[PDB]
Amino acid sequence: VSLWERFCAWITSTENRLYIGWFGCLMFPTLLTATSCFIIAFIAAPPVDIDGIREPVAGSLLYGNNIISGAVVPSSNAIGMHFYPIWEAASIDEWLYNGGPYQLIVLHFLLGVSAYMGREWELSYRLGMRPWIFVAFSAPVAAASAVFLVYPIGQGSFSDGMPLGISGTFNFMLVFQAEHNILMHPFHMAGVAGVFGGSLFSAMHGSLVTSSLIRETTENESTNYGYKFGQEEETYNIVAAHGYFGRLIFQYASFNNSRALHFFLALWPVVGIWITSMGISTMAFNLNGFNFNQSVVDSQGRVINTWADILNRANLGIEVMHERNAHNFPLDLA
Amino acid sequence: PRSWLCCSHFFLAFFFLVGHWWHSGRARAAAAGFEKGINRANEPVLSMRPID
Amino acid sequence: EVQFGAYLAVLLGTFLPALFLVNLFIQTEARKAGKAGGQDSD
């Protein structure tokens, strides 16, 4: 009867086209502002002093870029970790010079993605679902907050944060290799196993369902039209695909249970990306990966090279060349 | 010893945020009755509007 | 300096295959409106 109850009834209605919910009250204003500023800053945005040395790095399309090289540049080294909104900038020209829109996009992104995650919970509550799709979405939220939030914190500047682009991503990955040795760190190892394993069990499960489909169509029409939507009959012989994989490797390595099978597809990647995103986090605070340089010696004591020493000389090439003007002192403490 | 404390209590403090997500998803749904799954006799989606 | 044959590569790489996929949809809906026998078959 009241105005608030007629508003709570609408905002929590599943009869809307897109469910809004109470998290959409701060998902939609956040992500539309992260979007509408991203499209403008990617297309039309002046160059940005990223190294704090007043050498402005172009990143937008109107200043001679493309899809690959164009990128929303991170904020300055001069700012660093300080909060830099528009009203604390004394003009928009001073805001866009010092890496303004990187903080406006990222902070409205991480609020909107952490609200998109809670929105996946909310609709599962109002639909009668068991709730935990949003726990599986915690794994890219852990990884998005690792390269945009946690790594600028432990390194003390948003300038070490990830550039919102495509070539800026590979500037981020290579400089992160030289300074932290991520490939030898066992948490990037535990998530390469998460996505190689994840793409394995995806294409391994998706093939054994498509292999054992039941005849419901003719050879002229499509294979997919043998599934009517909302039917109650099972659309594939699960005993058939169990007997196949029960002979392809051996018998006891096969899940006859389809529920425990469809749980292992959700376990393996998500655990692999939780562990990986806490690799960037523990390497944000300079707890680097393994270092086996000069580890094998002869009885005389001369250093015998290994593959890690060849990997070290690739890291030394990126270390002596990243931010080639920003350094003045012999050790990259930042 | 700073890098051991900032990388281990930080390490745990994300997984306990995941513990807030697991244990409250179950507890809110155990209070409502559907933590064991959807009822076959009464599905809530079928008693809704057309989908659009 | 960009290659001036790339405009012909991209804008025909967009339009020619994308206008192809539109045609397979329009004749799909015409066959469905063709069999249905009401007001649109002719």
């Binding site: 399309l61 001679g64 870029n65 899809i67 939507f229 | 057309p50 659009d52 | 967009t14």
Partner: peptide
């Protein structure tokens, strides 16, 4: 002149995302 093509590809991609969400073929039981 060159960046005009890149912008048209980007907003043209966001058009077909708009039509796929709102003008989707709504699936129906029976």
């Amino acid at each position: 002149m060159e960046a005009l093509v890149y912008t048209f590809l980007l907003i043209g991609t966001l058009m077909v995302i708009f039509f796929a969400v709102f003008f989707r073929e709504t699936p129906r039981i029976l």
